[PDB]
Design a binder for these strands. Structure first.
Lengths: 145, 182, 135, 38
RNA sequence: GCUCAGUGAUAAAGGAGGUAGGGGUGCAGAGACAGCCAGGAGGUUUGCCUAGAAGCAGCCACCCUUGAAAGAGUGCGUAA
């Protein structure tokens, strides 16, 4: 494993898909990690604060509770799907992969997405990362130049 | 899948001495002495090297049924009269407890009357806690069979698992509630 | 041993399954195949329940071929005595499935997927079936 | 245990052992797989 | 020489390594198989649909990366 990171896992962690600046509503985040331990009142302020550096998309949040009332979380990179939708300028993917295409992306696009979304992909070289996300567009109906 | 036959060389330390005469090998040790009768058509001798030897008449598929059988009835007695065997029994549920009263053991598993279990020969029973029921024995058939009778009363129900269960027995707790739609 | 036919003046005698002489085909279409051992009166409700089952475990794949065709009609007596010959269409129609002849054929797929496919198809057949391959 | 004529194994957790001329199939996974005759 | 069924002194489709004989094939001390110990990862929480379904209702897709090994993947399970 040339890419360190293999540590302890499975410790009662919850993962959601909230949007940068969206966590105040009760119905949404409410039922989510509400009976775990973390207070619904908190997190929200500490969420839209760190995600304020780029409000406009969804950022993978990792919530991990403890034996106390406190809590900790880490900000990750957006899905390799939503990114291909932004570069292609489309709302949703296609209904039939390959059969129907919704948009197309250049090599520079797939390359830029692999870089921005690198500190989350388990790879070694750059030519790989790009090819890793390339297979994602081939599922939502998005051919590459 | 499954491989081929394989003998398990189990003899000496001389903590167990064998003495065969006629289709009846005798097993001794620091604990006690066991005896088992074996059918004919087979021979057995005590090698000078220090290993329980056993041979067969022919290489027929039926011979393996015998040779591969007596092979164990000669080793289970060895470790049985040396290392010994002790089974731990644990109970679950309120009101369930184990208490000894001499040579007999009494239990209370829902039954209106306290059931009693007698202790046979070549077998010993001890109860450290009202939840633990250990029973030391020499051989395996006795100590084992005596474990089925003490669990024959009321086994662990697939809802809460109460009554009598072997040590580290995964009864696999199953949800009793039904009708729910995933 | 039947397939979709067309309207016509069909209404003749019964017939009689003779020796294996006639039937004795081989494996032309498809990789593997399936033959019979003893002649019989295979109805349409059997071939249809066997064909759909052949592709029931596949769904969208290769193609099914039928190198057979029914002929010998089937007349049955209602419940009365015997005044004349039967109708010929009360229940259905059949033919003759003598041994040596080929029935179902599968190809364009793997060996395993084409093996279990014939299995269920054989269950639909009232007469015992023999599994083959090629050569 | 369901009688039936054709027992046949159910899941990979089936050993299908013949006992007293009667082929049985004990499954430690789901008792529903436990069949008698076959 | 086989059956050890009392089958032979009724009875099918089908099911089961109960069992004898003959031939051949795959893996195999660059050490296979059963068992024991450990790993079984990341994007993809994938697309579509759905109140929700993140291997595991269903439809389509089912490629790629890091490696000794690990399929967007079998069975159980959760409202998810």
């Amino acid at each position: 494993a040339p890419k360190p990171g293999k540590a302890k896992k499975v410790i009662g962690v919850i993962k959601l898909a909230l949007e940068a600046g969206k966590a105040t509503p009760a119905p949404p985040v409410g039922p989510a990690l509400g009976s775990k331990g973390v207070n619904i009142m908190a997190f929200c302020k500490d969420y839209n604060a760190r995600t304020a550096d780029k409000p406009g998309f969804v950022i993978p949040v990792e919530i991990t509770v403890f034996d106390d009332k406190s809590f900790t979380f880490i900000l990750k990179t957006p899905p390799a799907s939503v990114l291909l939708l932004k570069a292609s300028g489309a709302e949703k993917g296609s209904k039939d992969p390959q059969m129907e295409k919704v948009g197309k992306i250049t090599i520079d696009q797939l390359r830029g997405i692999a870089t921005e979304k690198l500190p989350d992909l388990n790879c070694t070289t750059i030519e790989s990362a790009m090819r890793i996300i390339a297979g994602t567009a081939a599922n939502m109906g998005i051919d590459i130049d | 899948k499954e491989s081929r036959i394989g003998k398990q060389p189990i003899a000496v330390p001389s903590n167990v001495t064998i003495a065969l005469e006629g289709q009846d090998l005798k097993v001794k040790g620091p604990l006690g002495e066991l005896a088992l009768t074996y059918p004919r058509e087979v021979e057995l001798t005590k090698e000078e090297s220090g290993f329980l030897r056993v041979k067969k008449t022919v290489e027929t598929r039926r011979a393996n049924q015998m040779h591969g059988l007596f092979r164990t009835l000669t080793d289970n007695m060895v470790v049985g009269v040396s290392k010994g065997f002790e089974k731990k029994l644990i109970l679950v549920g309120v009101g369930y407890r184990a208490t000894v009263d001499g040579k007999e053991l009494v239990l209370n598993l829902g039954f209106s009357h306290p059931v009693k279990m007698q202790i046979p020969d070549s077998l010993k029973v001890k109860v450290e806690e009202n939840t633990r029921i250990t029973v030391s024995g020499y051989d395996k058939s006795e100590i084992g069979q005596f474990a089925a009778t003490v669990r024959k009363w009321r086994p662990p129900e697939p809802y809460k698992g109460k009554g009598v269960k072997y040590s580290d027995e995964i009864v696999r707790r199953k949800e009793g509630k039904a009708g729910k739609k995933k | 041993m039947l397939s979709p036919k067309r309207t016509r003046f069909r209404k003749q005698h019964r017939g009689r399954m003779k020796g294996i002489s006639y039937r004795g085909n081989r494996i032309c279409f498809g990789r593997y195949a399936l033959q019979a051992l003893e002649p019989a009166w295979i109805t349409s409700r059997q071939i249809e329940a066997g064909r759909r089952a052949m592709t029931r475990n596949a769904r969208r794949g290769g193609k099914i071929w039928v190198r057979i065709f029914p002929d010998k009609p089937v007349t049955v007596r209602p419940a009365e005595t015997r005044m004349g010959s039967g109708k010929g269409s009360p229940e259905y129609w059949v033919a003759v499935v003598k041994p040596g002849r080929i029935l179902y054929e599968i190809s364009g797929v793997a060996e395993n997927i084409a093996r279990r496919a014939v299995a269920i198809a054989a269950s639909k057949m009232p007469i015992r079936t023999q599994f083959i391959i090629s050569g | 245990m369901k009688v039936r004529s054709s027992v046949k194994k159910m899941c990979e957790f089936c050993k299908t052992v013949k006992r007293r001329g009667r082929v049985y199939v004990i499954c430690s996974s789901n008792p529903k797989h436990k069949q008698r005759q076959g």
